[PDB]
Design a protein around this nucleic acid. Structure first.
Ligand SMILES: [Ca+2]
Ligand SMILES: [Mg+2]
Ligand code: NA
Lengths: 231, 51
RNA sequence: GAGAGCCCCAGCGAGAAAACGGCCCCGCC
């Protein structure tokens, strides 16, 4: 995360961190239930093998409520395309169930029509992760409020194809955006003090660049597929 | 209906028989008033954690 | 919308040094 703020105690309990063989974080994830994590399909090409950490706020000190889960199955969208990051979504089923506790709790899956009319139409969403603080990985979990950007402006802004499985969020010139290491993590939208999954950190033309935005997997397009992958 | 302040629903709102119908995500129960959503456990989805 | 053709298939099946087409989700006459 470039700019934004630290997640204070209990503020981002749905954040998951994908950790490689060296216990180094390289992507985020969103806790959906006791057994299921949402992430980006392209995060599955970043390490040879990995596990999932929950309940972490400060990676520099392994001090208390963290827990590490092995992955039982990977469910990548069959239509993921490396060249475009179209269909950039995957679900992980863990071998052992997460115990919800302080800093560990699921984000809500909304119903699709209501998500479209009521969440995607809000002014902003919230993105979080342990990614870089400018375009240099953060040791602390950060969050950032990102305005929704309308699709026409998004496409006009981008040098690469923005599919219907994507949406823009962030700022034109202001120095706040997701960055490397945040991919796969949560984009959630707040409605009456309840946070609903609306995106997956996907890609960007750099980080916080003038005239560019954050690109997110548009979760509404995948709610039916997520339910398939979790039944 | 649902476009008037989310039909007064806490969470999901939809219309049927020209009337608002409120609903709630998994791990919540619709309240007796038909509008508010009540957590069934200590860590309901979408809530920041306090203990 | 609907049929159909192909593509995809790290989920449930089946099979053969653990990203290796019957079914759910999904894509391109
Ligand atoms: Ca820690
Ligand atoms: Mg295979
Ligand atoms: Na920008």
């Amino acid at each position: 995360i470039v700019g934004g703020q630290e997640c204070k105690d209990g503020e981002c309990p749905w954040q998951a961190l994908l950790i490689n063989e060296e216990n180094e974080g390289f992507c985020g994830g969103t806790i959906l239930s006791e057994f299921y994590i949402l992430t980006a399909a392209h995060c599955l090409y970043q390490a040879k093998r990995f596990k999932v950490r929950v309940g972490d706020r400060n990676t520099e000190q392994e001090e208390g409520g963290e827990a590490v889960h092995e992955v039982e199955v990977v469910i990548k969208h069959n239509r993921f395309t490396k060249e475009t990051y179209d269909f950039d979504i995957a679900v992980l089923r863990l071998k052992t169930p997460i115990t919800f506790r302080m800093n560990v709790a699921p984000a809500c899956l909304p119903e699709r029509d209501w998500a479209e009319s009521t969440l995607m139409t809000q002014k902003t969403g919230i993105v979080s992760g342990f990614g870089r603080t400018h375009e240099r990985q953060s040791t602390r979990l950060k969050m950032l409020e990102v305005p929704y950007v309308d699709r026409n402006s998004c496409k006009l802004s981008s040098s690469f194809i923005i599919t219907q499985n994507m949406f823009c969020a962030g700022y034109d010139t202001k120095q706040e955006d997701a960055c490397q290491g945040d991919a796969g993590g949560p984009h959630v939208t707040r409605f009456k003090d309840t946070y609903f999954v609306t995106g997956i950190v996907s890609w960007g033309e750099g980080c916080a660049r003038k005239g560019k935005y954050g690109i997110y997997t548009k979760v509404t397009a995948f709610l039916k597929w997520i339910d398939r992958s979790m039944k | 209906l649902c476009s008037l302040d989310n039909g007064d629903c806490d969470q999901f709102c939809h219309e049927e028989q020209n009337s608002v119908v409120c609903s709630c995500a998994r791990g919540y129960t619709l309240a007796d008033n038909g509008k508010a959503c009540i957590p069934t456990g200590p860590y309901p989805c979408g809530k920041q954690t306090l203990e």
